[PDB]
UniProtKB/Swiss-Prot annotation, chain B:
Encoding gene per record: S
Organism the protein comes from: Severe acute respiratory syndrome coronavirus 2 (2019-nCoV)
Span of the entire protein shown here: 847 to 893 of 1273
Top-rank taxon: Viruses
Function: Subunit of the fusion protein that is processed upon entry into the host cell. Mediates fusion of the virion and cellular membranes by functioning as a class I viral fusion protein. Contains a viral fusion peptide that is unmasked after S2 cleavage. This cleavage can occur at the cell membrane by host TMPRSS2 or during endocytosis by host CSTL. In either case, this triggers an extensive and irreversible conformational change that leads to fusion of the viral envelope with the cellular cytoplasmic membrane, releasing viral genomic RNA into the host cell cytoplasm.
Record note on what altering T13N does: In strain: Lambda/C.37
Protein name: Spike protein S2'
Amino acid sequence: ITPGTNTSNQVAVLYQGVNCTEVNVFQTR
Amino acid sequence: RDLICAQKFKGLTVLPPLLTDEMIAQYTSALLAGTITSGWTFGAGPA
């Protein structure tokens, strides 16, 4: 998840198909 | 073992929709509330 290189360089990673155990942390659907 | 997890183990993973069943049901409630109370004006301007 990138808000845009011109805006910033911080990126978020979403591991689709995991329960935050087999990889801030927030478990979604 | 269900077929959902069975097909997932071969690369066939299903992505969840953006609008959940709860959020879609809330859109339908707004349409019903606008049709019964306002009529046809809630889609062509203000209610």
